[PDB]
Amino acid sequence: PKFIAVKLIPKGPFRDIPRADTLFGAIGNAISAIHGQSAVEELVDAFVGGARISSAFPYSGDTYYLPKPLSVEPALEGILTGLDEEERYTTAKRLRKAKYLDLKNFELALRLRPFTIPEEIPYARVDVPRVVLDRVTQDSSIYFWEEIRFREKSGVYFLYSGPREVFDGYIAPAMRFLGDTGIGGKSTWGAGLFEVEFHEMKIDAPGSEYSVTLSNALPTKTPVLWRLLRKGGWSFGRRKPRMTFIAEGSIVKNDPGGMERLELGLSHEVYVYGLTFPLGVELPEG
Amino acid sequence: RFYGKIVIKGKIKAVTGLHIGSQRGIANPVIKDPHTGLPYIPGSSLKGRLRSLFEILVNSRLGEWREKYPSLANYSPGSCRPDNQENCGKFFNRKINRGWIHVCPDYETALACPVCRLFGASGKESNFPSRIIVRDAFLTKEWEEKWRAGEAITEAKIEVGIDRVTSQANPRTNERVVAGAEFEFEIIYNVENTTHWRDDIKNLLTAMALLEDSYLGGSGSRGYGKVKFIFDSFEFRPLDYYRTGKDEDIVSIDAREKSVSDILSGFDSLFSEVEGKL
Amino acid sequence: MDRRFYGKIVIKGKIKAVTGLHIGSQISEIGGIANPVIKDPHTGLPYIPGSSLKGRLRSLFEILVNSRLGEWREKYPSLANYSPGSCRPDNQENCGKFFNRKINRGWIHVCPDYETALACPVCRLFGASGKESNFPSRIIVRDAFLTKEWEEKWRAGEAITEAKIEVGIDRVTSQANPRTNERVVAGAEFEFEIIYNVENTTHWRDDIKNLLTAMALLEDSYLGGSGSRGYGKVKFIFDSFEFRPLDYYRTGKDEDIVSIDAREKSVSDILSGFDSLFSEVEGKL
Amino acid sequence: EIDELTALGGLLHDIGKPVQRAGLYSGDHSTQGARFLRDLAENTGRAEYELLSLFSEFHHKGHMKNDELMIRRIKELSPERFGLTMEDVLNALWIVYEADNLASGEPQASRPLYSVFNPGKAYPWAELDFEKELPVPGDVFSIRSQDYRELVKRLWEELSKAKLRSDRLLPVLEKYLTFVSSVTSEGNIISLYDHMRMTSAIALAMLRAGCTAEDVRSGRCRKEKRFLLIEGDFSGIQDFIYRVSGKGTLKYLRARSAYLELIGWDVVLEILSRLGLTRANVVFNAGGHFMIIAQNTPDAVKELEEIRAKAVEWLYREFESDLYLAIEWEPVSGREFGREGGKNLFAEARKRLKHKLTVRKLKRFGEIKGLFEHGHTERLAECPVCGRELPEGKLEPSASDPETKVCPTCNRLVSLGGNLPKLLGFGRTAKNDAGVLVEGPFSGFVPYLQGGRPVGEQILVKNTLNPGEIPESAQFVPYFVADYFKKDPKGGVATFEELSMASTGTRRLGVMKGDVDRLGEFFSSMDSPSKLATASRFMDYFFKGYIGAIIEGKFGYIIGDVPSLRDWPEEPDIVVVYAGGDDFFIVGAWDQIFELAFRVRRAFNAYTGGKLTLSVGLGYFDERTPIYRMADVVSERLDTAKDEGRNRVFVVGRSRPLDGKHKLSYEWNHYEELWRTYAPRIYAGNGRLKGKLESKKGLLWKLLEIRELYVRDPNDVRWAYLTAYLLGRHGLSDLFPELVGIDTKAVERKEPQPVYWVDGVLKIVLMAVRR
Amino acid sequence: VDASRLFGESPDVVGIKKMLEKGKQWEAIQPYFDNVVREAKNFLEWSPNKRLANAVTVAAYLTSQGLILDMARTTELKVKIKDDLVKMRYLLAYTVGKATGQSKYSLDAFHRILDPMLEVLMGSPKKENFEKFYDFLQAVVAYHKFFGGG
């Protein structure tokens, strides 16, 4: 279909590539800052019905990357039948280890076509060492810290589907607030800051019964093919319990997911984003 | 609560050559961009140097600031390194690992501190978050083009160590950024309380003015600092800006002003329109 | 324990190279003057580092304190832990001799603790290091570039350096061994910057007078160079002592006490009447 | 019982093959195995050896003619004395006959065993001892009768002192039949032990399947699905053993690798006992991945569906989605074991099961039913070591520093890590017993120490095939492990800090992770289960047994001269974390981790026939680098050596241009030629440089600074004359004469200049001097 | 032999160090190359290895005899020159106007190569076309130390 693509042009290093539950927690903190409490409860109701955002994925110079579906690994002997067998084995190995695909090869992997992987990743994970210095004696205490450093024209983006007045009233004012404050990590070191641009993405998807998730899922029923993701964040100092999400690219069938409210002992209820972002996929016989 | 984000832009001039090490072909390397190989000033190295200069500033004026800043009456000048007990009566109360740093342990205490209100506090159960963002300072576009045109952006300076009796020489090498370089800094203050933001902007500019006579990173005592702030503009970015995006925010123009002139003169004069919309 | 702040005494002026000055260096270089002098990579002109000036002032001051370990000990405690000499003939780091650290193979007096370096005249002014404590320095000596009239003599076409050819002559066959030494020309003039950080109002007379003692020893000794061959001959030309109190940084106004000695000598400030020049500093402490 | 009689009949059916290659009796080895077992029933043996001679005289279909001489010969013996039914004994003989054809599908010479890696090369006969001898295939296809005669005498001595059970016989047979060829033919690459072992496996699976003697006489067990190939794999090992912080010592890691293997043995030994199988039904068990041949009965499919259900639910309670065991099974037939015509049916049924493992791994914890269900539990925390989430209060203080509250499964592995030098093995007993340190999904394991008595029905004894101090009612299960460690002044395992102190020149900790390349293609060429067994034991025995004797300084006439910084010590400061299957993870001093990577590869090159390669990633680390950091760098370096090309090593971190035409890792023969030319002209040995280069690091480091101009612009030619000026001024113009001019042949081949590949030789020499 | 070792692009810098470190064999192929350097009057026409090709064959000729640079170094610092290339051609004329004795021939061959490239530098821009010359002039001195000269 047709989606609004929210590009995030970085102004430094990120802490991690953002997911949809820490994007919804960042947006719900942004809406509470510039509107108030009763607009976050109007935000959650907009997401529960209709429109839902996806996870954040890298881009590198007008090539928008998307996660590889998990539908290809049972098929991946049948995808590569037209190859010489001694180079069919190392083409298969790197086609299974690959995490992202181009916007051109994502649309082919949804239809079980022969496809190719990107060679170069738009970011790197470095370990930059910081230090703690005593204020009288200058006694150093090294600790280590990891970041996401992007290239010259690279960055990250997520997708939005839904009505326009929810985007132009909540999501578009939030990402202008969230550009000057951070998305995750030590934003007081200037980490999660960016400039925001809004664009348009069109994705060819076959009409089918199965669908891949482009966000974390929190499924209501057991999915078809999946990959377990085990994270639990932090909310106003309170540790969240770890939850079993489903990584991006896993296959569900008529499964909407669902946001789960937590208690955590605050003045308000904390919602963890668990909605699906379905794009139609084609499966083999299992 | 949230009211706006005072945005400070300008340039960092390295008047004498700058060193911020990585400890990873020069023997001690300054830290560099992983992709393009250009050096930069970290946001943590600039923030922690502004805090360290200001924690020593507040340690000298604990008695004189008991009334403008409460919960400076909970501290006595000194460090907690002699008696190995955290959050005691001394000012440098928290031992992160091997170093002692003033961090107030509570939200209601750090809200009245001058340091931890501006720079943030950890605490147990409490977690006061900071109000400023210090971005990474990368090279200006004029100094990226000098790098494309074949000039050198870092040198290799050889120092030595000399015996006081026999005069044996013991040399080492230090990579440091070439003196004269221009970096592009960015500080974003988060206006949470409309009452005390004038003090927080002035306490921040005081640490900038202590930094121009002190050094940044480096060896510094052997002349590796000598940093200089060159301001460009002070934006206010109100709450009405983030709702609708119509670009009618307050811009204070200081194209050629020092940190002493900015804090010394101006502020009421420069920040007069900022104080109107609160 | 209890590092404070009161102000930053700033010492500005000029470094006069009365005799040729050579601070050496050592990479995409093929044909040039051998044994070169250090130069700013962006502007091309030579300079004096803060490392080569602070280390030369510390070295002349440690040797002066080593000569008198019975005449400074009544005013400076923890000098009773030191016997005059060096730790070279018995290779232990911290024994009872004065020069007590091994850098790589040489021996330099650097105090091993915070409480030891707080009462030493060398390491409370120049700083120390060690296993824990790490007493940090109170002066910062900056790299000294040319003055702005010797920036412009370079624009006018005059030579800022030269090349001096010296020959090591064999004493038996009178057979030569020439080499060229670049040296900054005699008469050249470097603009320096020495900032003393006032951390204790009790002993700041003792650190300024010891810093001016080390400067007075340097005007009799040499800077950089091969100075026993006539290559040093430095001279300090003071422009202004200034004080910069703690209230200068918060206010940003010119509340800094200005001592006026634009036409005085390094042994004239430390000379009788020093009390008269630094009298207004005591009115602000 | 017919259960023990069918299994020990098929195991000993080929007995006397080694007495006919020796020649103690008259010809036709089926006659000699009847006489070798009749004489064995006389002295130092029971009377069941007399009835097991029926299995060695009525096979290959040569004497079992017309169903008349089998009845008379069995009638002479007393079945009733043994208690076996007269008809039931006859039923077993047909099953043994059928399982012999299903295991091989295959003379007159004493021709040796040929190597499964080179079928052109052959093994000389040795023992299976892993001590002072490396079995390296050679072109010597001849076996002396006296050598066979010596083997028969040792075999006769050990079969007389050995209890008549499948577990007892299997280590006796393995010791002497490992290097004996089964069928005498040119290029026979199947071990005689493997053929005998796979024959007791199939004959016992046929007996559990219920097929009788007339089912074999009519050929009904063949061409009907009566067998069932079990296969398991642990998934998430890297995130299970190496996801540990700076609070994990070397001992804790070395106990994590011993605890994953006890989880693996607890599942495999549960399948064999609960289905009636012996240990010969296990085809291989190597690297958290096993394969078992069983029977296809509805009682067994029901019974394997509980072993899978209980073990996955145990792993989910203990380790919250960090380690998963995917168990699948595929029904096969008798004709499916072999190559039928020209089509390989064993490699097709194996890959019909390998696709079922693939879809199971994508349904990662689907057999839980509360997997994606949320449940609110208050007051949860994390362990400082492995970082699992528990409800707090279940945390308990660690014995190192009692301030930190670790989880209880990490204190069982700190206390196990202190016993591993003292440990002779384990005993498999019930979940709630005294002495149990760690629990599996089905059992608990008591450590069997040096001076002690083992308790349990199954005793796992490490690094030997002799049951010395073991009770005669307990089951003997041997397992092998690469357990080399550098010992401290105490009798324990050295630390990361103690190994790095011993390193030459710069003090760094060397970490290597290497594995065999394209092994899974090599195992798909096997067309019979007796051939998959041989290719999997010999590949496992290199990393289990022979990689620890490479570290002992042996095999030097095979290894020769490798790139070394110092001469090889008598006790190398090397600690093996893991080595088994086709991979190894070894830490130590950085000088010997460097040398052993070329020393393991040179011996693996000759352990195989030169036909299989390695890729090794090397890393050199600070002592206070956390091991989750040290295992993620070297795994990234192993995958960079593998994706770029196979058979290349990642020596050290290097800077290379981004054109896609440079690569970071060295081919093994490439780097080992660069060390023969660049290193003896700069390096003298044991940390010092050569003459006229002492205290000339102003030459060597600047040569790496000229090399960094090539990295910025490879087409700029500045670096070429800067080298010749630098070499010329120092008078060392003859050192490195090919870095001064550009290689015109390298431009046409689009391969890098010789200044690009000098980095990984100089850097190592510059770290062997104190850096 | 001498033209087989000193070939077109880069054949043997290590092979030319055996003959030069013999007298007249390189004195013809490099004099043809000096004539080719005289045919390389257009300096900025060699963006290939030709600057490294010529400077080996220049320095292999000048090795047979004895054999401004800081003025070329200071005018290189001026980039970050028509008034000083007159002085640079003057100091190059001053040296050949001084060197009398056994070193006339090495200085006249050194005079033969640079002044054809110092005529194009008069009527040309200064950021380009001098960087390509100062890379050549460094490469002549670099190999000249390598072959055993000073």
Place this chain on the structure above:
RNA sequence: GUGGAAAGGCGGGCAGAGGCGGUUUGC
């Protein structure tokens, strides 16, 4: 309603020690 909040890669370290642009004889 953000796997979050807090945290300077730096304390100390002279590019220095010894050295007459000089000698011998002729083409």
Place this chain on the structure above:
RNA sequence: GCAAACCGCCUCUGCCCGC
């Protein structure tokens, strides 16, 4: 009538201690 021979660097040091 005025020069021409060689000598153009030599030899030591070159990352430490802490987290």
Place this chain on the structure above:
RNA sequence: AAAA
């Protein structure tokens, strides 16, 4: 993860 080429069966860690």
